[PDB]
Amino acid sequence: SPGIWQLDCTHLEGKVILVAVHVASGYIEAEVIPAETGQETAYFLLKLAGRWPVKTVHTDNGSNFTSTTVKAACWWAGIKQEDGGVIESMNKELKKIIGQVRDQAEHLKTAVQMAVFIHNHKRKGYSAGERIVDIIATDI
Amino acid sequence: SPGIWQLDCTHLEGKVILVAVHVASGYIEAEVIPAETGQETAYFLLKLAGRWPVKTVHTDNGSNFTSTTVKAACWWAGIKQEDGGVIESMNKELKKIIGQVRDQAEHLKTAVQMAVFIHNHKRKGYSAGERIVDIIATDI
Numbered sequence: 683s684p685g686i687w688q689l690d691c692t693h694l695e696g697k698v699i700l701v702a703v704h705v706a707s708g709y710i711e712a713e714v715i716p717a718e719t720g721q722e723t724a725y726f727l728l729k730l731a732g733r734w735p736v737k738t739v740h741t742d743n744g745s746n747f748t749s750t751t752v753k754a755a756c757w758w759a760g761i762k763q764e765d766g767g768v769i770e771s772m773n774k775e776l777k778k779i780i781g782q783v784r785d786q787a788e789h790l791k792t793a794v795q796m797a798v799f800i801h802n803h804k805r806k807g808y809s810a811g812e813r814i815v816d817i818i819a820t821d822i
Numbered sequence: 823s824p825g826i827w828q829l830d831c832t833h834l835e836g837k838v839i840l841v842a843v844h845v846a847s848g849y850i851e852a853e854v855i856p857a858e859t860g861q862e863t864a865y866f867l868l869k870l871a872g873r874w875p876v877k878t879v880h881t882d883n884g885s886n887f888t889s890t891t892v893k894a895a896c897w898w899a900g901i902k903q904e905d906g907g908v909i910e911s912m913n914k915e916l917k918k919i920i921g922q923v924r925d926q927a928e929h930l931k932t933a934v935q936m937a938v939f940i941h942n943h944k945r946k947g948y949s950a951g952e953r954i955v956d957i958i959a960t961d962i
């Protein structure tokens with residue numbers, strides 16, 4: 683459980699928001715990209731795996747599953763690539779927060795990182811950031 | 823100790839590598855940018871604070887300390903901004919790893935994220951990624 687992540691892709695303002703969700707905690711990382719490609723997904727995953735112990739990634743669709751560039755990044759980073767309700771509720775919630783901060787941010791990416799911050803800090807009493815750290819520390 | 827980070831800036835291939843070091847563990851996050859500006863530093867810090875519990879940032883120079891954009895990001899993210907050997911050895915080590923992977927990466931940013939990964943996973947027996955998680959979990 684501690685090493686399992688789910689990728690998730692959603693659209694906003696003509697751009698794409700790529701999200702990784704740590705399944706057991708609900709903790710997220712996200713980035714704005716112009717469109718989802720294999721190279722963007724591969725790079726996102728390389729970043730994620732250098733920061734957290736990513737063992738398994740449930741890819742968000744069959745194109746990223748099939749992408750040899752994504753496969754190369756999973757190979758490089760030691761990630762097991764696998765296939766994929768709660769995430770749909772996650773996308774609506776992320777878009778909700780983005781709308782609440784949109785007035786504070788000129789750039790979409792700034793608003794998206796504000797929403798990542800608010801999501802990971804929200805208490806509902808532990809936060810997702812506390813849960814992911816607690817879950818991984820007990821694995822150690 | 824668990825919430826203290828040090829910013830660090832170094833040059834390579836005509837670009838800038840901006841590094842945040844979790845002081846107590848040696849864990850790092852890094853990004854390639856064209857040049858260090860207040861807006862790039864502010865954005866980097868917003869990202870960092872949504873992912874880890876950043877309480878205090880020792881800024882890397884007086885321009886980022888003074889930057890009202892950096893101050894605004896620290897205010898937004900609840901970071902105490904403060905002022906600033908080991909980091910110089912960190913920069914040399916990061917450049918060392920980047921050179922070892924440079925042949926595997928077309929883009930500098932890819933090589934930089936490979937070096938972030940290798941740095942955080944290296945055992946020297948715990949890794950920096952294990953230490954930062956252990957340090958923060960005990961604070962909880």
Ligand SMILES: Cc1cccc(Cl)c1CN1CCc2cc(-c3cnc(C)c([C@H](OC(C)(C)C)C(=O)O)c3N3CCC(C)(C)CC3)ccc2C1
Nearest residue numbers: 786787788789792861864865868890891893894895897898
């Ligand atoms: C709030 C504060 C605290 C302490 C001192 C001072 Cl004196 C201030 C007032 N500041 C004085 C500079 C300043 C710059 C900004 C600012 C300017 N341009 C842009 C592009 C952004 C931002 O993109 C970035 C993230 C910089 C790429 C965006 O996408 O909107 C900015 N940030 C808004 C979001 C933020 C995370 C809060 C950081 C600041 C906003 C507000 C303020 C107001």
Ligand SMILES: Cc1cccc(Cl)c1CN1CCc2cc(-c3cnc(C)c([C@H](OC(C)(C)C)C(=O)O)c3N3CCC(C)(C)CC3)ccc2C1
Nearest residue numbers: 721724725728750751753754755757758926927928929932
């Ligand atoms: C290694 C492997 C495992 C499983 C299946 C397959 Cl069949 C393969 C072979 N792959 C078959 C596709 C492919 C694409 C690449 C690839 C292509 N273009 C670029 C720009 C990059 C990379 O930028 C990115 C990170 C994609 C923006 C860069 O900066 O160099 C690439 N990555 C090199 C680094 C990586 C983290 C390893 C991920 C792949 C490299 C190697 C391979 C070799």
